[PDB]
Amino acid sequence: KHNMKAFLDELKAENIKKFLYNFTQIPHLAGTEQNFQLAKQIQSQWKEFGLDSVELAHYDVLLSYPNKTHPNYISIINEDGNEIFNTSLFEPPPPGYENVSDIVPPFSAFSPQGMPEGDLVYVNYARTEDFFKLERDMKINCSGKIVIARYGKVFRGNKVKNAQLAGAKGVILYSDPADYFAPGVKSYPDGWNLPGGGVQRGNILNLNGAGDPLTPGYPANEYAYRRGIAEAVGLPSIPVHPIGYYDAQKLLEKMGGSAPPDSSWRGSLKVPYNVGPGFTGNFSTQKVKMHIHSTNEVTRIYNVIGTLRGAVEPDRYVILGGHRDSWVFGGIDPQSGAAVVHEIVRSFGTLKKEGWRPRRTILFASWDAMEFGLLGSTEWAEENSRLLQERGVAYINADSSIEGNYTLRVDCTPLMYSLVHNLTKELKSPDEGFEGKSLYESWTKKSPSPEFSGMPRISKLGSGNDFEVFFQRLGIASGRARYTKNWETNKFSGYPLYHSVYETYELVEKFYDPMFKYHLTVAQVRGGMVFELANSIVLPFDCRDYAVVLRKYADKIYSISMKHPQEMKTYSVSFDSLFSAVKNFTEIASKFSERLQDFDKSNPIVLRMMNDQLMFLERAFIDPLGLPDRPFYRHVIYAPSSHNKYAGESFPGIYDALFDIESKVDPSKAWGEVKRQIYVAAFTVQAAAETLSEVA
Amino acid sequence: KHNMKAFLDELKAENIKKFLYNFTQIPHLAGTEQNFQLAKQIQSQWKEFGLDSVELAHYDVLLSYPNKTHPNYISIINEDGNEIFNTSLFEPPPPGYENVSDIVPPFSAFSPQGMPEGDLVYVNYARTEDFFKLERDMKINCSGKIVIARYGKVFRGNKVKNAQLAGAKGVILYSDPADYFAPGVKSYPDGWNLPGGGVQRGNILNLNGAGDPLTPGYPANEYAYRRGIAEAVGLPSIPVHPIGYYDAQKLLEKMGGSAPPDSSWRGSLKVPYNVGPGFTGNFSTQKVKMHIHSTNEVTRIYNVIGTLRGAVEPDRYVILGGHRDSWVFGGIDPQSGAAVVHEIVRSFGTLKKEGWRPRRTILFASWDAMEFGLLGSTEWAEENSRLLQERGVAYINADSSIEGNYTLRVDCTPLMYSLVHNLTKELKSPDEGFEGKSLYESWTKKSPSPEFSGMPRISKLGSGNDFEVFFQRLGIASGRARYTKNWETNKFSGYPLYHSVYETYELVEKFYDPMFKYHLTVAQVRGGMVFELANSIVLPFDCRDYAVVLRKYADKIYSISMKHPQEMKTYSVSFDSLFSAVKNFTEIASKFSERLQDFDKSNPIVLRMMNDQLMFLERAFIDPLGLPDRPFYRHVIYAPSSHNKYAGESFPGIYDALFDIESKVDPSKAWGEVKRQIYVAAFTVQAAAETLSEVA
Numbered sequence A, B: 001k002h003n004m005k006a007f008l009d010e011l012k013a014e015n016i017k018k019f020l021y022n023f024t025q026i027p028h029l030a031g032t033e034q035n036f037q038l039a040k041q042i043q044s045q046w047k048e049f050g051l052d053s054v055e056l057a058h059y060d061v062l063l064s065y066p067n068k069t070h071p072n073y074i075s076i077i078n079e080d081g082n083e084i085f086n087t088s089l090f091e092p093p094p095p096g097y098e099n100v101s102d103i104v105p106p107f108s109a110f111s112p113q114g115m116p117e118g119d120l121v122y123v124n125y126a127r128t129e130d131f132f133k134l135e136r137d138m139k140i141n142c143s144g145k146i147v148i149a150r151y152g153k154v155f156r157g158n159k160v161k162n163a164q165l166a167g168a169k170g171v172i173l174y175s176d177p178a179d180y181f182a183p184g185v186k187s188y189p190d191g192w193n194l195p196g197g198g199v200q201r202g203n204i205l206n207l208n209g210a211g212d213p214l215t216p217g218y219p220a221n222e223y224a225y226r227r228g229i230a231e232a233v234g235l236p237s238i239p240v241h242p243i244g245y246y247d248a249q250k251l252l253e254k255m256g257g258s259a260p261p262d263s264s265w266r267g268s269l270k271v272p273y274n275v276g277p278g279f280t281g282n283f284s285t286q287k288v289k290m291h292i293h294s295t296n297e298v299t300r301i302y303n304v305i306g307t308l309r310g311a312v313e314p315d316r317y318v319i320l321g322g323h324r325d326s327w328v329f330g331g332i333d334p335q336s337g338a339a340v341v342h343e344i345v346r347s348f349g350t351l352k353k354e355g356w357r358p359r360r361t362i363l364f365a366s367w368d369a370m371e372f373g374l375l376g377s378t379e380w381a382e383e384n385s386r387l388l389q390e391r392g393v394a395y396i397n398a399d400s401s402i403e404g405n406y407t408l409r410v411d412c413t414p415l416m417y418s419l420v421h422n423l424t425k426e427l428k429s430p431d432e433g434f435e436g437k438s439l440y441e442s443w444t445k446k447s448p449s450p451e452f453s454g455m456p457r458i459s460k461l462g463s464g465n466d467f468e469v470f471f472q473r474l475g476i477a478s479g480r481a482r483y484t485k486n487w488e489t490n491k492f493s494g495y496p497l498y499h500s501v502y503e504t505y506e507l508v509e510k511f512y513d514p515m516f517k518y519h520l521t522v523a524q525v526r527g528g529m530v531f532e533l534a535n536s537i538v539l540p541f542d543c544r545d546y547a548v549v550l551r552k553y554a555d556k557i558y559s560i561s562m563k564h565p566q567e568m569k570t571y572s573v574s575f576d577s578l579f580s581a582v583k584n585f586t587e588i589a590s591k592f593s594e595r596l597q598d599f600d601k602s603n604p605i606v607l608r609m610m611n612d613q614l615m616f617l618e619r620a621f622i623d624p625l626g627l628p629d630r631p632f633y634r635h636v637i638y639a640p641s642s643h644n645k646y647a648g649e650s651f652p653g654i655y656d657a658l659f660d661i662e663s664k665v666d667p668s669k670a671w672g673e674v675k676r677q678i679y680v681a682a683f684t685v686q687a688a689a690e691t692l693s694e695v696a
Ligand SMILES: *[C@@H]1O[C@H](CO)[C@@H](O[C@@H]2O[C@H](CO)[C@@H](O[C@@H]3O[C@H](CO[C@H]4O[C@H](CO)[C@@H](O)[C@H](O)[C@@H]4O)[C@@H](O)[C@H](O[C@H]4O[C@H](CO)[C@@H](O)[C@H](O)[C@@H]4O)[C@@H]3O)[C@H](O)[C@H]2NC(C)=O)[C@H](O)[C@H]1NC(C)=O
Pocket: A577, A578, A580, A581, A584, A682, A683, A686, B055, B056, B057, B058, B222, B223
């Protein structure tokens, strides 16, 4: 038979390993020839694998690169202006790659050029609360200072935004061993830890969903009319550069001024972690100088778009997408995910060659320029927004398949919770000690849901990955899954060698997944989800699961507001309308579910009506006016946190209206805006509910 | 059989007459008890007529009313401050209605309160070009003057906006006999002309599609959070009041200053039409004083919403909608249209009682508060926007059925041109001299298309009517039709007694349509369109007709730009991308049309795919970012003219970027924005075309 089991059984660990090796021998930086070559290779292979059509979709977008003949670096300069200490110009290449060309040196993409020199202030992780603590509690002024922040906890773009608004004239990011060196594990190449010379690359934009900085709203095609740089979206105004902890140590060791306010401010280096500003007495006349000469330039990028036409509903699209561009070799990020996508295409293509086709169309995407701001997926979705919004069933992302070897991690819309539960109950656990048990069982045991015994944790979607346009802009149900670490063991924001030259094929093959069994489990979950979404007669979404979480989020936002009981009385702030809408959603969804079970199974119009109702339910949470000052975040239930693009926030409009409200100078105005956001959320919830009522 | 002919034949002129009489005996001003009573009556009757459900949808919206105990009026005051001349407090009521209560006196709805006193400037029709001529050519400064403008040519809201931006401190609108008195016809009650004491009511908002001024974006429901008045949308900042030509004569006769610049500035009164400012020598110390005391107040309004559930595609909606609220008796506007809707419901209900149902769902709407800014239809569409955008097939409007007795007038999306041509070829002409001929034949003869011999004129949709939210905001194919006058005979912007107390049942029965045959023809066209839209297996839209007009509009906008050849060279302004997109649209639409003809007629999925492609084609012209500073006008091909809300403009983004461009102080910036609009239009056209490509 051609069923899900045939699909799953065709997937092979050994194929994923071969593809990963193939994709990670040279760098594939967005906009470079090497990445265009790989694009053409994957196009060719997807065609040979059997897809009906495979095309490149190219765009001309703003990227950023260091100047090869004018290196970025930071100095300590003495009062004479002699540079007495200089940070590294490159990471020491790993064994056997010391002759690889075109390894981009560490840099912060989209930094402006400049050579600011000043006194250092240490700002911990540069989170909103870290700046609050500096200004409000410690009375330290960052205006005109160079800020040094440790990576971790939040997206680095938010750090840079926060430093700018504090008045910093430059930012230095570094990786502290506290956050990127797991105790008892060796540095690469002998373990999976970050060495003192390792550095995390990465962009520092604040795009808020816009895509290419020059063309917000519209694809960066041949004839596009670009904004000038001064009106581009999301560019930082101060120079920024990342360094490793050997170099960080040499910048921090001299710091004077105030002590760190508490231990949550101290990392693991042998330094006091003084906040500054500036250096202790003997060194007080020395300063820090950055030298940044990177350039922004419009550069062509290439997405690969594969189509497997549906047999019955070709005008319904289930999309499996993940990026192909990497900072250097991309051993984990993204090629561990791209190798999984490749094998999924291969497997679906095998069935197709034997005469099968999915019920609905499957689109496969190899996105470009993700590392420079989700540019490739966003431009493509801008180009294709009307097809995607009227035909898009679901989007399954496929970045890094592994970031650990402990258990599964899934973030998705509530509409996919039941699908994920049911699919994982069918799959075999790859975990030691769970031989012959289901993935559901191992996952639930290692990662229990905080709410419900006997179920696993599934998180909301955040951002910083290629689902952002499809979910928070366009309202297409989205999900993602990968293998991850035990967050109780270390609690780091990622894996140590993230975005470093040390992220290699050997990293994965030797330390993360020698038998490629976690990769295979991830291919089964991602591929399985796509299979069911594209082949189930009734779409596999359970609207009742949205009702349950909407109540949890309404409770949560209410509890936040209820910290201000006097203001709620003064300004008559009521959540009654939101709870009412949620109650109605619960009731209507329950009735819809009965019809879906009970409808006449011979009637394809009733079926498609109810599949359209299922498909357009995520779509109903979109507000076409967007959230305040973030027009490309239109989903009213979920947006990326305004303080950390990686994290999702629920009822974001209300949350941001309530955030730090006790500090606003005009409370009447501030609480007015809370009430406005309550109204918008209540209305959108009720409106979404009504899409599930009988249609006439 | 139950077919279109059965539907059409059930319609009776005598029923329309009875309903019109029934709807016009007392005033039905929005927000009054009398209009809520009529709402309940139409709800009851639509249920008895056989609709499946009929509900009221109510909203609480900003309306405006004069103060009953503090009348609005204008004076000429002498230097002592004695009011030596006062305009009327009411229109002399027509015969037999001199005892009717609650006739609202003439006023401009949403005027602020004030009693400004100043010198008069006469500004012709207060169009953009009239102000250009005053400031630029005649060097007359309106700052701090009271402006007197004749009604006509453009929507009165645009006049008030234009007067404000000229710095006027108040506006007086009047009806000039040149524009509202047809030569050789008697004044009401002895003819259909406006008497000297007649006055045109009407709102003076600039909403740009927003709906209720306090709640843009969201329905004005129970829990809505309102803007304060100072942030409301579209309210005028200067007092405004309309008067008749007896009173206008007494204001204009003393005017001094400059002569009218030419005869296009002179109306028909026995006055010189001097532009002013102020009065001639002997009267130079006299001034004009307005006294406006109207109040804005949030008031409940009621739409009636009738549903006739579709047998096969209940989740596809064909909407017939028109308003019910009137300024006074509403003899033409709107009850001549509402009486037609009522008979259409009756006819469809007769078929339903005999066991028939349309293929798709038909929604019938009796809108409220249209006269105060299309409020009722817009709030309802805001409430229901997600159902309408995913399920809305078409909207047919149904305001005034007649404004003359000469020939048909149709404005609609190009997608309905073929439908209208085919339907009118089936219908009998009611015109004298065309007995036994088709409506198509009489209409084509009396109103030839400017482009194509042997076809009739069909105009683009403008605004100032209840289709605005459905078409220009939501992108649902829309159309309207009514009987009209011979524009070659007089060329007035409407009919003389528009929005006056004299617009009565007797006006219609005695002067416009004694045998109710034009009303019946209009019921057949509107009802016929709804019938085909709701019952045709393939939706009756021809995408090729859009391709033909897109080329006409691209030629037109190109020709406008080509008046500035030097700037097009300097700033490299090319229309190549727009023409390219239009060419592609033409090619793809041609291929789609072949598939639509040729597809396998047994396959309902292919059918519905192609019906969805047809339905979502108007939808593809929507840009969710809206046009510049007009977020609720999102259609890129059509918007209401920025200079006259009643008129439609094509490629409005480009048109407004080019308008008066030779006056802009920064030409680089201005031509940049032209190019930006070219890109947006080319992209949207191509994107719309691609919705008609094979789906996978
Ligand atoms: C969750 O779902 C429920 C439905 O089960 C919704 O209930 C509606 O709630 C609103 C209140 O927010 C009710 O509004 C009230 O309607 C009365 C008239 O309703 C009748 O007539 C309408 C048509 O006009 C019918 O559709 C309806 O069935 C009724 O027969 C008004 O008279 C009320 O206004 C008066 O009282 C209020 C409050 O004290 C005053 O502010 C007013 O000035 C006025 O005096 C009121 O407008 C509505 O009728 C309910 N519909 C039902 C029960 O079907 C919830 O609203 C929904 N939650 C959300 C968030 O949408």
